Structure 1
Amino acid sequence: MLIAIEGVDGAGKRTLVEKLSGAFRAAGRSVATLAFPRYGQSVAADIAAEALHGEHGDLASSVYAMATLFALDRAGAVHTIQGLCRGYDVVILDRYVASNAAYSAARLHENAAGKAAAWVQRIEFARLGLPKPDWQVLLARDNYERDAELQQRTGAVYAELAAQGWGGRWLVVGADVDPGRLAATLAPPDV
């Protein structure tokens, strides 16, 4: 059972991962988590963050370049994800491939059917062989405005991916989602 938590609000996404983990562990199922990017454990992830803050020349001026770094991050964790799914009952990922497609398409002002989204699905799932997630849970100066526009675009792209079952079945939940009900819906009792 590989579950990926997506959304634009990271602080709430982290909370949902905590409440969801406690619910699964309360039901007797073992849980293990992993957050992307893997800052401090992957050189590709650290480079991306550093490029964001002006390092590495023009590396940040290419959306696909940054997306590639993120994709390479998960590529190095493939055997780590496979190991967790074999030794644990539930594996919860804080952000996954869907994040790369939603934010990449938003930056390029594209939709779910855009070139950037299809490229993400192609390179990470088909070429890199990243495990397909069983569930993808969507949690619904002047620079302050240039950001809010990217969040709304990313959030809309998220809504498109979930509506079309991008990379697997989805499940849209609000911040007020009940953890017990969500964990019972993702992994019902009696297998």
Structure 2
Amino acid sequence: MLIAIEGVDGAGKRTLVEKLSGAFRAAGRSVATLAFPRYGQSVAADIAAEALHGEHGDLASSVYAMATLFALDRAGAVHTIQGLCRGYDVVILDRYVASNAAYSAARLHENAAGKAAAWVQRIEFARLGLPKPDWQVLLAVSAELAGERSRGRAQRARDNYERDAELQQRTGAVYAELAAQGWGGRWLVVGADVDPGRLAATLA
């Protein structure tokens, strides 16, 4: 059971992951989680994160270069993911391939029918052979609320993606299209106040 949690920055995905982990365990299922990008576990991921903070010259200016780095981070995680799928009943991922499709498309002002989303699919699933997720869960949230989380959980720093209010808005919209068309597999759209117990009963 591979489950990917998706959503814009500040959507509160960690929380959902935690609450979902609990509900699955209470139901007698073993759970392991993994978050992408794998900061500290991938140079590709670390360089990508630093680039979003203005480092590494013109790296972040290229939409496909950034998508590639995130895709290569996941590629070096293929074994880790498979290992978790064998060691646990449910594997929960905080962000996965659809993050790349949603953000790359939004950065290019494209929708789900654009080249970037199709490119992401070919590269990650068909070429890098990343495991297709059984369920992709979109945590839909208020754009204002999500944006405030970023401004708050920081000024208490936001990278180039987090500061781009319009990018976040378009990402949420592409996410909705992906979910609607079952991009990459079966999706489930949930809200913040979603019930963990039923969510887990629904997914499994």
After TM superposition, the score normalised by the length of structure 1 is 0.93
Q: Which runs of 4+ in 1 moved over 6 A?
A: 140-146
Deviation of the 1:59 alpha carbon: 1.1
Does structure 1 retain, via aligned residues, the 8 Å contact 2:52–2:160?
A: no
Query: How far 1:19 moved relative to its partner?
Result: 0.2
Secondary structure at 2:34 match in 1: strand
User: Is the CA contact (8 Å cut-off) linking 2:112 and 2:178 kept in structure 1?
Assistant: yes
Q: Distance in 1 between matches of 2:158 and 2:82?
A: 45
Partner of 1:121: 121
Rate the CA distance shift 1:145–1:176 in 2: closer, same or farther, 3 A. closer
Identity %: 100
Q: 1:141 to 1:97 in 2, by over 3 A?
A: closer
For residues 167-186 of structure 1, the C-alpha deviation after alignment (integer angstroms, 9 at most, x for no partner) is: 00000011110000000000
For structure 1, the 5+ residue unaligned runs are none
CA distance change for structure 1 residues 142 and 62 in 2, over 3 Å: closer, same or farther?
closer
Q: 1:121 to 1:63 in 2, by over 3 A?
A: same
Matches within 5 A, 1:17-32: 17-32=17-32
Unaligned 5+ segments in structure 2 are: 140-156
State the distance in 1 between where 2:54 and 2:164 align.
18
Structure 1 residue 10: Cα displacement = 3.9
Aligned position for 2:78: 78
> Which stretch of the first structure deviates more once superposed, 1-10 or 16-25?
1-10
Q: Deviation per CA, 1:36-63, whole angstroms, max 9, x where unpaired?
A: 0000110000001111222222111101
2: CA distance, partners of 1:105 / 1:144? 13
Contact 2:52 2:161 in 1 (8 A): no
The Cα RMSD (Å) is 2.8
Q: Using structure 2 for the length normalisation, give the TM-score.
A: 0.87
Instruction: Provide the secondary structure at the position in 2 that maps to 1:68.
Output: helix
Kindly provide the CA deviation profile for residues 90-112 of structure 1, in whole angstroms up to 9, marking residues without a partner as x: 00000000000001100110000
For residue 144 of structure 1, report the CA deviation from its aligned partner.
11
